[PDB]
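Lab notebook, bench 4. We co-purified these components, and the gel suggests they stay together. Before we commit to crystallization screens, I want a quick structural picture of the whole thing.
Request: model the full complex, all chains together.
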Amino acid sequence: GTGYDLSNSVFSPDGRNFQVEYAVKAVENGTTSIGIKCNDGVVFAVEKLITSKLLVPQKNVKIQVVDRHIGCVYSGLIPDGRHLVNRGREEAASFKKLYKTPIPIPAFADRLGQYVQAHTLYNSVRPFGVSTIFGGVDKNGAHLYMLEPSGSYWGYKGAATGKGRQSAKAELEKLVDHHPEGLSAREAVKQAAKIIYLAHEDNKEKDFELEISWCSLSETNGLHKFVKGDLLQEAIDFAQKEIN
Amino acid sequence: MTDRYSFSLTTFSPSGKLGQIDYALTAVKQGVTSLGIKATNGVVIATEKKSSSPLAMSETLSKVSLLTPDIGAVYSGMGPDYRVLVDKSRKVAHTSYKRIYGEYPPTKLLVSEVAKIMQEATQSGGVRPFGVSLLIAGHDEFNGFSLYQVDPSGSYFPWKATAIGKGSVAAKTFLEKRWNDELELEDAIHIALLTLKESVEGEFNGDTIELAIIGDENPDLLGYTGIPTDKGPRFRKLTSQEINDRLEAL
Amino acid sequence: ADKDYSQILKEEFPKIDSLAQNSALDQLLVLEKKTRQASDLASSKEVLAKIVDLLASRNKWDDLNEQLTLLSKKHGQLKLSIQYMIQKVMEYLKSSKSLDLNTRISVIETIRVVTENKIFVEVERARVTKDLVEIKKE
Amino acid sequence: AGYDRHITIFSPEGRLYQVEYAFKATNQTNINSLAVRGKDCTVVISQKKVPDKLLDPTTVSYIFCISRTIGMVVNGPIPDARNAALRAKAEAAEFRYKYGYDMPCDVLAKRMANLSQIYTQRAYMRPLGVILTFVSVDEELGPSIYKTDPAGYYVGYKATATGPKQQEITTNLENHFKKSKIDHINEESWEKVVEFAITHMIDALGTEFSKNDLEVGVATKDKFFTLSAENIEERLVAIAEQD
Amino acid sequence: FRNNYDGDTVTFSPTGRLFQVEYALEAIKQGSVTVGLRSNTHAVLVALKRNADELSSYQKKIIKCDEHMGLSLAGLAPDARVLSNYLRQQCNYSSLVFNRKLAVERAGHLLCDKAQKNTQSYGGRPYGVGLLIIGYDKSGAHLLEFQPSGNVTELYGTAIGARSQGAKTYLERTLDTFIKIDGNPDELIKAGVEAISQSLRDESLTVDNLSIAIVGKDTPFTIYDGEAVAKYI
Amino acid sequence: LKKGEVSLGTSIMAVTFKDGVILGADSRTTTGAYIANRVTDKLTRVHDKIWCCRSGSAADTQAIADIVQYHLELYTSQYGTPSTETAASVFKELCYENKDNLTAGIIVAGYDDKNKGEVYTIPLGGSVHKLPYAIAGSGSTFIYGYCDKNFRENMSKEETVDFIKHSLSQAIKWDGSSGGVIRMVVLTAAGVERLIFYPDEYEQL
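Here is the predicted assembly.
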């Protein structure tokens, strides 16, 4: 039959939730956004779509932090992620409350997906319209994950969500091969800005702003902070030259 | 979220019938044929142990389970459907009888309970009935040995002897042929061996076959000594050997 | 594959170091490690053939047999690589004969690829098949 | 009505299609895997498939270490995978906490077995499309293999494989076991047991495996565990020595 | 079809879309037009009060949740009233709990995921109103817009409901003018007055129809209606 | 320590030292004057390399142990070995919460590789503190001056032992409730080492 598509928790004859798949529709429908596990840390980058003059630039900021060491970014319903962001922002302090320690990214991870996985478990519990690039420096080094409304994330030496991923997918996979060594966050900072523009080129049609952040065990000192100002402008100019 | 299905998941057919129930008996009748015989000297129930794989260790599952030391039962249906019931079934007995009465219920009430259960599984919202029916071997003092068949309908009732599952009919047929009031258990056992072998298409031996009896109280199984009043369980599962033994008694 | 060439070329002398003087491993260890079962730079089968032939010419075609016997076992660069040398080896075992026919006779079912089938190179492994048969005949 | 497939309710046949479809989701991951009780040990091998570079491949396992003693392999989606282990994780310490000694493997199985049967019976509850095999070397039962299904059905195994090609290794081991005639692989070094397995996994899968190819784990007395790629490589090396 | 995919906010389109949202999104433009803008100094609301009849009163689209914070609406008032009240709590709450003014920023954060819950949760529905929200704070005057999609944005200016584009285009056209009109609410206002005139279509703004609000630096959220709108008319 | 549960008494003490931490306490469990179990093992494994000295109600602590251990276990079953600190964090809650139901002073001592041994006090106050070394229990009183003077940091493995043993014996000597035998447990990179000392030994030190 059909209708398997309709209700979340339903296993279609193939054993599949098409809603989740439909969620993925909304997911890829998300603005292209990337993240980079770099040497000490991870770096998060996303195009900020400028729809108008009236948009106050730099105000609306897609990447959100959990604790101070966990940066997160997602393509999908901005309410979804934020909803889950706080949902995450909970668990850390929660964890950190019980365990006195800020939560390990991986620890922090599985929490989320299970929660997300809940959003699979019932036909009504509409999964989240977001897949989310997230991670940061934790007790051991950085980590970078990107989580599916399925409840699938994994370790990602780089990750990209949104439309322009494929522009990025190479770009990351490039720097994978360009830098199987590793990369300074700042170069990841630089590289990403390109990649995003490149990722943006999928979306190239309209003006956009660029949100980039990062967790550098070096620079943020095991924290997540935003790529900002000159090094931001650098990476831009870096990128905006390399886009040419 | 949660369950928003609170409504009876089986409903009166235009004929008043309850389809899922009537569908349950399907899968119930589907069950690997399981038999039971209430003999004079005791009760024995039997069924073939169905291995889905030789790698799979058949013994590691038991289609018959003791409930009270004098009570055990068999099913025909989904092993899982068989699984949880016993737990409750055993549990409720302690709770709803023993822990009250400090002793093991008359099989009837013990039976009566799980019957009630499945009715709930029948009528409750968000639930389906179980995919098993239950041939129930029990002995209590005043009611002696007892043989009870219970459905996912919870419909239950005594037997002199019986069988359920896939080939139950011709077995029961053969049983009805075979049965008398006076059947001795080993007879009935042998009878079941006869009976079950009939419904046994696959390998027929102790390792393939599950036989349990309500025998005498089994002080060997008392597991302790120095209490005269406690003479052990009446329920007994026979060995693959004792089967394979009595399979030569064929 | 620069080192695959270079380290070979490095081993070239390094073999010729103890070849002219084993360095059988000098040649080997390079591709032995590098290609192993898992290519690093991989190499040319030559780099492995280089080994084999620097083995071959230098060593006993007796030992080379047993050598390649094991080299076969890890990987080679491929089910092919060595067994081309192994093929010319048979000419060179026949560049040997008697016992080096018997050494060849050794090489026969050491791995089939001389008289028989592991590799598909029957155009060769058939030869030694008959070629030994031709002797087996004799 | 036809919802009977959409939901868990007895089909006209008394059948549960979501279940039957959950069975689809089981190999939907398309990972073949095995569980072999060694003599001393129990060993579990599985396909580690690393489709992407961007992956951190290390992160990829369906074999999960449940307890001190107990691990489990999952056959099914990693969300549902990651779930049941969690679910399993509780019971152990729980059981242990409650019962003062660690949970026996099958208990978890029987436990986890109960779980789907619920969802099986619990319509809004969906059962999970993962097939799970629990293994340990049980203080009582020694080497142990317990596989469970989306249906809450489960059993002990002299050994098992699972995956799309399960039947093949199934035959293989069934062949080898009907051959070997003993429930367990008789080897004192689980290494050999592993090496035996990786053989017979390579064997029946007709598939040579790199160390990145294999999800490999070993249930040993008091400790279930797994191997790095190097023990795997050691095996790959070791197994390359028998052949 | 959609009745398959639209009916449930829990249920994506095959394209992964929630038509109820899109539906709620429809009631938006269905709503009366209203306008808002901010300077860095002040943040101004300009509303079109629609009535039922002349006999009836004129529906007010502007809300005060707070001195530093008040908002305007288009689409379903009942939702916002809650939300506003709900919000009113928050500034209160904050200034209760923390003696801290709710960040107009932090405000927008709230309703979003709050709205998000309306979305992902079956049996329910989104709110039927998108919001224009002016606020002034330690970070200054902030005009924020909300979407029953949950999505919020700070704009220098904006308008919603019906045909807000005319103002909007003009406003987006007007952009740097008002944002630089600073300490001059009036022209901040009259910009909107012109703005709303842009998206004025049916008739002109009136004493009854025009509604106006401003929060600003030292301008608390302050609503202007009738004679208060009369001079700006 | 409710009426009818047994009284441990003695004195529990633990010292992080050059190789790690060692736990120690007496074996004496008294009921008023009557020692219920003189041989009791009062040192306790919440975790392999993370451990505890239990004072206050055993029934408190005894349960308390199972609790945190259960969690750490599960936590480890999830996230692996928590820090020795992380375990006490779990305790701290319990204490800092159920304190009004709780009589437990606890020395949380555990060996981390990175941080070597880690001493953590949790008095009944639900407060938590890391120390170079800890002493608690009855006779801890008498020996504070002793330990304080006679303690040193990165004392060798044995230096820890007998100084502790003396510390304990003093307490054991001095205290009535402190006695039975000295059980010590060494937590190092090496691992857990339980020790025992008989009165005929440590009585005389």
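Chains B and F do not touch (no CB pair under 8 Å). Worth comparing against the SEC data before the next meeting. Helices of chain B lie at 19-30, 79-101, 107-123, 168-178, 185-199, 240-248.
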